[PDB]
Amino acid sequence: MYFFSVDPRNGASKSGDVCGSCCCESISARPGEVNGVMVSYAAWSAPLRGHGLTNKTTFEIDGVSVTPPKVSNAFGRTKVGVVFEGTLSDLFPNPEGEQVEYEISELNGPSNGVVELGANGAFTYTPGALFTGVDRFWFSINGNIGEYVISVDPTTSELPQPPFTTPVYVPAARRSVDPRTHVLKFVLGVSPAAIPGDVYRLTVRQVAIDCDGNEFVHISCYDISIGSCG
Amino acid sequence: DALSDGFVRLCIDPSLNFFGEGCKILVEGQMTDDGSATPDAVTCVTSELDIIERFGQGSVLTESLRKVFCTCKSGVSVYALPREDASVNPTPNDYATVVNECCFAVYVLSSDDTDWQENLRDWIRSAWDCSKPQCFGHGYVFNKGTLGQVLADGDNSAELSRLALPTTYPVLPYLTNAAYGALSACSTCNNPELNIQGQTFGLLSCINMPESCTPGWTFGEVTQLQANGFVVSGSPYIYNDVTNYLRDEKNRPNATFRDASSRRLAAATGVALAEFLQQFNGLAVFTKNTNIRTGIIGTNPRLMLGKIRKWAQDNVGTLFSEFDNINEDIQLLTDFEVQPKCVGQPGIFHLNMRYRPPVRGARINVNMAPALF
Amino acid sequence: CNKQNGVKNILITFTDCDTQEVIGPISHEQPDDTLPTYKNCAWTNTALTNGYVQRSASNATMTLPVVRDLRVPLAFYQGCAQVDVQVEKFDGTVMTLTEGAVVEPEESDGRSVTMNIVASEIDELLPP
Amino acid sequence: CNKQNGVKNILITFTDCDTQEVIGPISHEQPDDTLPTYKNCAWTNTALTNGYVQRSASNATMTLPVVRDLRVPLAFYQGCAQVDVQVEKFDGTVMTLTEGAVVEPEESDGRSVTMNIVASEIDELLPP
């Protein structure tokens, strides 16, 4: 669990501005992990004697070094109870001539089904009986990692399309704030397809509140460094 | 013969390096097609084996690099960022990706694109303040034209030395700029303090300018853009080797980071301070009831401040000047108190120190008064 | 005011002058009520005549009694190891010392030594 | 301040009479309490009979003990290079000697040399 103490935006910080520094904080992450981050706004919100923070936090993800992926992702659809078939060769546009070692990691496999990988870029997915939702599984074509999404329908018409989860993301609703101790908690999820060495930037906009209901904004920045083996 | 039982291995070799080459210098410019090299990718360049094969016959980068190798031939592991062609000169912004962790001290850009120069400035700056493995280094670039333009084609950017060139300057700017940067780099590898100026040390060797009887910038316009930070060159020697730094946030009068030497010294002190602080790793920090127990490797903020002040007061004289008030400049602003026992993460002990480079020699204006008896 | 005289923390770092291996910084405990002594000025004076004085160069000294730590060999206290010491009093003062050298070793009994450290300069941090 | 007999700065500049290389001006530190000693009058005197004296030509001498700087070779102090020395006392006096030559070198141990410098003339500055 990461723990950060926020700039109090008082004065001493960065000798006023003379210094400046304020280089965004560091967050080391590993592809596949799902960690938790806490930030203590006390040093900034304690002098502002009022009703602490509010549940109006905002996040943003932008990549400063991305290394676009080699293998593309894919989406498929099927009904409940009926077995699904698919190929795994048309997802790897190879510029050079080489061999394709298809693989499905047992760690990041499906959740409500079973997949049998074919001998030549094929796969058979039997979904879990008496189930209707979405399913994902992560393939490793020649080392390059990608995800395959399957939508099982409740046999009636159709299910919508999920948004193909990003390398780094923050869960939709898993954030919280304790107005008693001025602490904001959230989760940081790293997809198994994030390439080591890439660097993303996360900016957090948190709003406090005075004694009468007005607002006080604060913005902070962190660099998520996608590294391998820790 | 002898030497037929081992215990000696003669390795006669006319060419052989044993100097722990250092001081990397990145040179960047335009190529031409024939250069068999990947555009937009930091390339190492061993020696003058590849003249145009991977650079290009006529490429400005080729000629600049040639001048660079001419100036000095020792200890500088030259590099290259061969930007492609487009006239609308190419304006890269890629640098962050392109030049990754590798810490090139001296940057040499061969162009007059204010945009390109500004981008290089930004990269160097973002390297100084932020960036992990704290890189370092000054940037060298030229600027040519008439007073008005050159005087108004430079901001308070301290990360660059803008060699000013007259509109009639009868040389290709690229050559002179490259030469200057190269010489500075080669000289300041072991010792940074050396002010590259005047005739003796700062005489650009490989320029062979055609001797004339009238300069470009005359005394007036010179005196003018010496207050305004520029690197006026008179073979031609260099003097007033300063950077385009005139003003801190608003209080214009400021002379700390004027001389390039000051900047290089600041870098040398940064790396030394880092290697010093490295000792303060993997130990305790009793910060509530400081009573460090017998037989434990521990410290408290006060002892830290003590040791820091000690180191500082020791290094006084060579790395920086005498602190006016050492108990104000040094400050080990910590945050440990915030950190609760319900988590282990230590390590925010930021330190902020002031800087006043060692005072040097300058104008010694004399006034002789002849007389008789 | 002037809170009680006395020492609170004593830190010592040993560096063997042969293998350049470093140990510490370790804490220590006073063996009795006496306190370490100091002399900061690196220039002693000598009484000349008629009020004048000869200002020559000299060394900043420090005398410090400590209880031997049962994991550091006794030789490291007797002057076979370069030492860096730091003392902090109750009133807030701290005295740091780097590249010290134990001079004039005195015979000890194995549990309480009195080291006569000599260094180029001792630095203070007069309390806030 | 006034009334302090002692040295404050000692500058030495070495020039090799073989390769014409220059080193300095490097500062030095006194090894003990002895001060550098001087003689400015370049004319020695000899006691004749009945109040007279034979005024002959002589040199300006200087005796200077200094700690060898671990960057300059020892040979430069033993009379193998031309030296340019310049001293300043605490009371303001500063004595300059150029193009001196170390005469009659003495044995040394490697850390404290005693130079007997001979020169044509020494100048004093006589604090205001």
Tab-separated table of N, CA and C in Angstrom, chain B residues 192-304:
chain	number	residue	atom	x	y	z
B	192	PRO	N	35.608	21.181	-13.449
B	192	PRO	CA	34.532	22.026	-13.984
B	192	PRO	C	34.757	23.515	-13.787
B	193	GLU	N	35.575	23.875	-12.799
B	193	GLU	CA	35.693	25.274	-12.403
B	193	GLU	C	36.256	26.149	-13.516
B	194	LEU	N	37.027	25.566	-14.434
B	194	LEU	CA	37.796	26.334	-15.411
B	194	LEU	C	36.899	27.196	-16.294
B	195	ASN	N	37.042	28.517	-16.184
B	195	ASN	CA	36.291	29.461	-17.004
B	195	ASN	C	36.822	29.490	-18.431
B	196	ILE	N	36.103	28.876	-19.370
B	196	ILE	CA	36.559	28.834	-20.754
B	196	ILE	C	36.336	30.199	-21.386
B	197	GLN	N	37.343	31.067	-21.320
B	197	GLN	CA	37.209	32.417	-21.842
B	197	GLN	C	38.591	32.966	-22.158
B	198	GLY	N	38.611	34.173	-22.711
B	198	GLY	CA	39.838	34.812	-23.107
B	198	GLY	C	40.503	34.114	-24.285
B	199	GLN	N	41.769	34.466	-24.491
B	199	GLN	CA	42.529	33.955	-25.623
B	199	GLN	C	43.101	32.573	-25.346
B	200	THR	N	43.919	32.449	-24.300
B	200	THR	CA	44.669	31.227	-24.025
B	200	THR	C	43.804	29.973	-24.067
B	201	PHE	N	42.833	29.879	-23.163
B	201	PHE	CA	41.946	28.719	-23.081
B	201	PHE	C	40.531	29.163	-23.434
B	202	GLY	N	40.155	28.890	-24.679
B	202	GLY	CA	38.921	29.395	-25.246
B	202	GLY	C	39.137	29.853	-26.672
B	203	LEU	N	40.344	29.623	-27.174
B	203	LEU	CA	40.708	29.910	-28.557
B	203	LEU	C	40.208	28.747	-29.402
B	204	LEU	N	39.065	28.934	-30.063
B	204	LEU	CA	38.561	27.901	-30.959
B	204	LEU	C	39.620	27.585	-32.006
B	205	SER	N	40.196	26.385	-31.932
B	205	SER	CA	41.353	26.044	-32.748
B	205	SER	C	40.989	25.933	-34.222
B	206	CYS	N	40.077	25.021	-34.545
B	206	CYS	CA	39.736	24.754	-35.935
B	206	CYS	C	38.639	25.679	-36.446
B	207	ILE	N	38.944	26.960	-36.637
B	207	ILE	CA	38.007	27.835	-37.334
B	207	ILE	C	38.706	28.518	-38.503
B	208	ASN	N	40.011	28.768	-38.361
B	208	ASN	CA	40.834	29.377	-39.402
B	208	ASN	C	40.121	30.501	-40.145
B	209	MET	N	39.427	31.367	-39.409
B	209	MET	CA	38.663	32.478	-39.968
B	209	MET	C	39.546	33.328	-40.872
B	210	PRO	N	39.018	33.844	-41.985
B	210	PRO	CA	39.836	34.697	-42.858
B	210	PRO	C	40.129	36.041	-42.220
B	211	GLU	N	41.403	36.285	-41.900
B	211	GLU	CA	41.817	37.514	-41.236
B	211	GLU	C	41.255	38.734	-41.951
B	212	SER	N	40.735	39.670	-41.170
B	212	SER	CA	40.072	40.849	-41.712
B	212	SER	C	40.500	42.053	-40.883
B	213	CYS	N	39.858	43.198	-41.132
B	213	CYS	CA	40.211	44.413	-40.407
B	213	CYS	C	38.986	45.124	-39.846
B	214	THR	N	37.852	44.442	-39.738
B	214	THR	CA	36.645	45.022	-39.172
B	214	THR	C	35.795	43.917	-38.560
B	215	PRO	N	35.400	44.050	-37.303
B	215	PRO	CA	34.591	43.007	-36.668
B	215	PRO	C	33.130	43.115	-37.056
B	216	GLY	N	32.291	42.327	-36.398
B	216	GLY	CA	30.861	42.403	-36.596
B	216	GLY	C	30.285	43.308	-35.532
B	217	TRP	N	29.793	42.727	-34.445
B	217	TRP	CA	29.426	43.518	-33.278
B	217	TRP	C	30.566	44.449	-32.891
B	218	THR	N	30.293	45.748	-32.901
B	218	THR	CA	31.261	46.727	-32.440
B	218	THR	C	31.168	46.859	-30.924
B	219	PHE	N	32.062	47.673	-30.359
B	219	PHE	CA	32.138	47.833	-28.912
B	219	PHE	C	30.780	48.149	-28.296
B	220	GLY	N	30.019	49.016	-28.927
B	220	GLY	CA	28.758	49.385	-28.333
B	220	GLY	C	27.866	48.184	-28.214
B	221	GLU	N	27.406	47.696	-29.345
B	221	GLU	CA	26.480	46.585	-29.326
B	221	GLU	C	27.036	45.411	-28.504
B	222	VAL	N	28.356	45.294	-28.382
B	222	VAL	CA	28.911	44.242	-27.528
B	222	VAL	C	28.556	44.606	-26.106
B	223	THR	N	29.208	45.626	-25.554
B	223	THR	CA	28.839	46.103	-24.224
B	223	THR	C	27.342	45.968	-23.984
B	224	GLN	N	26.535	46.197	-25.019
B	224	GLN	CA	25.089	46.048	-24.887
B	224	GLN	C	24.720	44.614	-24.531
B	225	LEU	N	25.012	43.669	-25.420
B	225	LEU	CA	24.662	42.286	-25.129
B	225	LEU	C	25.814	41.583	-24.417
B	226	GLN	N	26.282	42.208	-23.339
B	226	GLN	CA	27.092	41.548	-22.325
B	226	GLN	C	26.349	41.695	-21.012
B	227	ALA	N	25.719	42.852	-20.818
B	227	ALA	CA	24.669	42.946	-19.816
B	227	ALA	C	23.603	41.897	-20.093
B	228	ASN	N	23.073	41.883	-21.314
B	228	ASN	CA	22.235	40.781	-21.755
B	228	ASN	C	23.117	39.581	-22.073
B	229	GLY	N	22.859	38.467	-21.396
B	229	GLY	CA	23.743	37.319	-21.443
B	229	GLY	C	23.916	36.688	-22.807
B	230	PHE	N	25.111	36.827	-23.378
B	230	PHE	CA	25.458	36.182	-24.637
B	230	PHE	C	26.954	35.898	-24.647
B	231	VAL	N	27.387	35.144	-25.656
B	231	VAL	CA	28.693	34.489	-25.652
B	231	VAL	C	29.551	35.036	-26.792
B	232	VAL	N	29.561	36.361	-26.952
B	232	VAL	CA	30.248	37.054	-28.043
B	232	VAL	C	31.642	36.498	-28.308
B	233	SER	N	31.926	36.201	-29.575
B	233	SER	CA	33.237	35.744	-30.023
B	233	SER	C	33.844	36.825	-30.904
B	234	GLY	N	35.130	37.095	-30.708
B	234	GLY	CA	35.815	38.125	-31.466
B	234	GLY	C	35.922	37.828	-32.948
B	235	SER	N	40.487	30.490	-35.835
B	235	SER	CA	41.146	31.298	-34.815
B	235	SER	C	40.215	31.876	-33.736
B	236	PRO	N	39.161	32.647	-34.131
B	236	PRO	CA	38.518	33.575	-33.183
B	236	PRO	C	38.286	33.021	-31.787
B	237	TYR	N	38.748	33.761	-30.786
B	237	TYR	CA	38.683	33.345	-29.396
B	237	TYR	C	37.326	33.690	-28.796
B	238	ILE	N	37.027	33.050	-27.669
B	238	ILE	CA	35.774	33.238	-26.951
B	238	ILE	C	36.061	33.976	-25.651
B	239	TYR	N	35.121	34.816	-25.237
B	239	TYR	CA	35.162	35.477	-23.944
B	239	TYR	C	33.738	35.679	-23.450
B	240	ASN	N	33.623	36.066	-22.178
B	240	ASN	CA	32.385	36.251	-21.416
B	240	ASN	C	31.488	35.019	-21.482
B	241	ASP	N	32.083	33.844	-21.266
B	241	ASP	CA	31.380	32.567	-21.388
B	241	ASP	C	30.331	32.476	-20.286
B	242	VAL	N	29.188	33.095	-20.551
B	242	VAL	CA	28.080	33.085	-19.609
B	242	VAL	C	26.901	32.402	-20.272
B	243	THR	N	25.814	32.251	-19.531
B	243	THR	CA	24.590	31.673	-20.051
B	243	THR	C	23.520	32.750	-20.129
B	244	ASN	N	22.443	32.443	-20.848
B	244	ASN	CA	21.361	33.401	-21.051
B	244	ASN	C	20.465	33.463	-19.810
B	245	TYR	N	21.099	33.747	-18.677
B	245	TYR	CA	20.427	33.844	-17.388
B	245	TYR	C	20.611	35.255	-16.862
B	246	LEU	N	19.505	35.966	-16.677
B	246	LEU	CA	19.550	37.344	-16.214
B	246	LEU	C	18.711	37.619	-14.986
B	247	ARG	N	17.711	36.800	-14.689
B	247	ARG	CA	16.689	37.193	-13.738
B	247	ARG	C	16.075	35.950	-13.109
B	248	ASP	N	15.991	35.952	-11.782
B	248	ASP	CA	15.176	34.986	-11.067
B	248	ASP	C	13.764	35.546	-10.994
B	249	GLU	N	12.845	34.754	-10.441
B	249	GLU	CA	11.430	34.797	-10.804
B	249	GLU	C	10.937	36.179	-11.217
B	250	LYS	N	11.193	37.206	-10.409
B	250	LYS	CA	10.965	38.564	-10.879
B	250	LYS	C	12.090	39.530	-10.524
B	251	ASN	N	12.793	39.300	-9.419
B	251	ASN	CA	13.809	40.227	-8.935
B	251	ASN	C	15.046	40.181	-9.826
B	252	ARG	N	14.992	40.873	-10.971
B	252	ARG	CA	15.961	40.775	-12.063
B	252	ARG	C	17.413	40.647	-11.608
B	253	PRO	N	17.964	41.587	-10.810
B	253	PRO	CA	19.382	41.471	-10.440
B	253	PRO	C	19.706	40.151	-9.762
B	254	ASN	N	20.501	39.321	-10.437
B	254	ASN	CA	20.902	38.025	-9.910
B	254	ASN	C	22.072	37.482	-10.718
B	255	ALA	N	23.127	37.036	-10.037
B	255	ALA	CA	24.356	36.652	-10.715
B	255	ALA	C	24.848	35.260	-10.336
B	256	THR	N	24.060	34.484	-9.593
B	256	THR	CA	24.487	33.146	-9.203
B	256	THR	C	24.771	32.280	-10.422
B	257	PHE	N	23.747	31.994	-11.219
B	257	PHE	CA	23.921	31.140	-12.393
B	257	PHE	C	24.217	31.954	-13.646
B	258	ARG	N	25.194	32.853	-13.574
B	258	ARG	CA	25.571	33.609	-14.759
B	258	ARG	C	26.636	32.860	-15.546
B	259	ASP	N	27.787	32.629	-14.923
B	259	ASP	CA	28.868	31.913	-15.583
B	259	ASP	C	28.528	30.436	-15.726
B	260	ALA	N	28.809	29.883	-16.907
B	260	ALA	CA	28.642	28.454	-17.139
B	260	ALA	C	29.355	27.633	-16.070
B	261	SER	N	30.557	28.069	-15.695
B	261	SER	CA	31.323	27.447	-14.624
B	261	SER	C	30.487	27.253	-13.367
B	262	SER	N	29.701	28.262	-12.995
B	262	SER	CA	28.804	28.146	-11.852
B	262	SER	C	27.877	26.950	-12.017
B	263	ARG	N	27.256	26.835	-13.190
B	263	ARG	CA	26.368	25.718	-13.481
B	263	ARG	C	27.075	24.372	-13.347
B	264	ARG	N	28.257	24.260	-13.952
B	264	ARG	CA	29.012	23.013	-13.890
B	264	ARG	C	29.398	22.676	-12.452
B	265	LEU	N	29.785	23.693	-11.681
B	265	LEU	CA	30.092	23.494	-10.272
B	265	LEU	C	28.866	23.021	-9.506
B	266	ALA	N	27.704	23.603	-9.803
B	266	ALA	CA	26.465	23.174	-9.167
B	266	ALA	C	26.199	21.701	-9.446
B	267	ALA	N	26.461	21.269	-10.680
B	267	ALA	CA	26.319	19.853	-11.013
B	267	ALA	C	27.282	18.986	-10.207
B	268	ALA	N	28.552	19.399	-10.152
B	268	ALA	CA	29.553	18.652	-9.397
B	268	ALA	C	29.187	18.563	-7.922
B	269	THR	N	28.579	19.616	-7.381
B	269	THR	CA	28.149	19.583	-5.989
B	269	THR	C	26.910	18.726	-5.804
B	270	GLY	N	25.999	18.734	-6.775
B	270	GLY	CA	24.834	17.873	-6.687
B	270	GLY	C	25.210	16.410	-6.614
B	271	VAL	N	26.099	15.971	-7.506
B	271	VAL	CA	26.459	14.554	-7.521
B	271	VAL	C	27.195	14.172	-6.238
B	272	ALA	N	28.048	15.068	-5.735
B	272	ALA	CA	28.782	14.790	-4.506
B	272	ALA	C	27.838	14.708	-3.312
B	273	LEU	N	26.918	15.663	-3.196
B	273	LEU	CA	25.920	15.653	-2.136
B	273	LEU	C	25.070	14.393	-2.186
B	274	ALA	N	24.709	13.949	-3.390
B	274	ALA	CA	23.948	12.714	-3.536
B	274	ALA	C	24.733	11.531	-2.983
B	275	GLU	N	25.973	11.363	-3.457
B	275	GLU	CA	26.790	10.249	-2.982
B	275	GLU	C	27.043	10.339	-1.482
B	276	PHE	N	27.038	11.551	-0.933
B	276	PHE	CA	27.169	11.730	0.507
B	276	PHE	C	25.928	11.213	1.219
B	277	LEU	N	24.773	11.785	0.880
B	277	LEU	CA	23.493	11.412	1.470
B	277	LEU	C	23.233	9.917	1.364
B	278	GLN	N	23.871	9.258	0.394
B	278	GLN	CA	23.702	7.813	0.252
B	278	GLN	C	24.004	7.051	1.539
B	279	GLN	N	24.825	7.615	2.429
B	279	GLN	CA	25.122	6.920	3.680
B	279	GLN	C	23.901	6.865	4.588
B	280	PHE	N	22.977	7.811	4.434
B	280	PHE	CA	21.791	7.871	5.279
B	280	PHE	C	20.702	6.929	4.783
B	281	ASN	N	21.047	5.670	4.535
B	281	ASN	CA	20.095	4.687	4.044
B	281	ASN	C	20.073	3.476	4.966
B	282	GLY	N	18.880	2.916	5.149
B	282	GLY	CA	18.709	1.727	5.961
B	282	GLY	C	19.127	1.886	7.407
B	283	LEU	N	18.548	2.875	8.081
B	283	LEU	CA	18.815	3.095	9.498
B	283	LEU	C	17.542	3.668	10.104
B	284	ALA	N	17.484	3.835	11.416
B	284	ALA	CA	16.257	4.300	12.040
B	284	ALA	C	16.193	5.800	12.067
B	285	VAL	N	15.076	6.369	12.507
B	285	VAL	CA	14.998	7.820	12.645
B	285	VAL	C	14.161	8.280	13.839
B	286	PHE	N	14.532	7.915	15.066
B	286	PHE	CA	13.759	8.249	16.256
B	286	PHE	C	13.361	9.717	16.216
B	287	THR	N	12.056	9.987	16.164
B	287	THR	CA	11.591	11.348	15.920
B	287	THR	C	10.468	11.768	16.869
B	288	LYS	N	10.218	10.976	17.910
B	288	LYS	CA	9.300	11.441	18.942
B	288	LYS	C	9.992	11.549	20.292
B	289	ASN	N	10.520	10.428	20.771
B	289	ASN	CA	11.256	10.374	22.027
B	289	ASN	C	12.736	10.131	21.776
B	290	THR	N	13.415	11.054	21.094
B	290	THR	CA	14.768	10.744	20.652
B	290	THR	C	15.652	10.416	21.845
B	291	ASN	N	15.884	9.122	22.052
B	291	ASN	CA	16.760	8.603	23.092
B	291	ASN	C	17.476	7.365	22.582
B	292	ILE	N	18.034	7.444	21.371
B	292	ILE	CA	18.504	6.291	20.609
B	292	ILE	C	19.173	5.278	21.525
B	293	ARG	N	18.660	4.052	21.522
B	293	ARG	CA	19.072	3.072	22.510
B	293	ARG	C	20.513	2.640	22.275
B	294	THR	N	21.119	2.097	23.324
B	294	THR	CA	22.483	1.608	23.211
B	294	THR	C	22.543	0.423	22.256
B	295	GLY	N	23.493	0.479	21.329
B	295	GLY	CA	23.701	-0.628	20.419
B	295	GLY	C	22.694	-0.757	19.302
B	296	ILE	N	22.176	0.352	18.781
B	296	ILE	CA	21.313	0.333	17.607
B	296	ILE	C	21.774	1.417	16.643
B	297	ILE	N	21.727	1.109	15.349
B	297	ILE	CA	22.141	2.050	14.315
B	297	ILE	C	20.991	3.007	14.043
B	298	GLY	N	20.959	4.123	14.754
B	298	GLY	CA	19.835	5.036	14.666
B	298	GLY	C	20.283	6.479	14.633
B	299	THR	N	19.349	7.345	14.253
B	299	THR	CA	19.581	8.778	14.222
B	299	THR	C	18.258	9.506	14.402
B	300	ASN	N	18.353	10.813	14.623
B	300	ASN	CA	17.194	11.679	14.701
B	300	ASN	C	17.412	12.918	13.836
B	301	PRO	N	16.339	13.629	13.436
B	301	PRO	CA	16.499	14.780	12.531
B	301	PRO	C	17.590	15.763	12.928
B	302	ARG	N	17.741	16.009	14.232
B	302	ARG	CA	18.729	16.980	14.688
B	302	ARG	C	20.146	16.538	14.340
B	303	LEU	N	20.477	15.275	14.615
B	303	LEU	CA	21.798	14.766	14.256
B	303	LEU	C	22.013	14.803	12.747
B	304	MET	N	20.956	14.545	11.974
B	304	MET	CA	21.049	14.676	10.524
B	304	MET	C	21.442	16.092	10.130
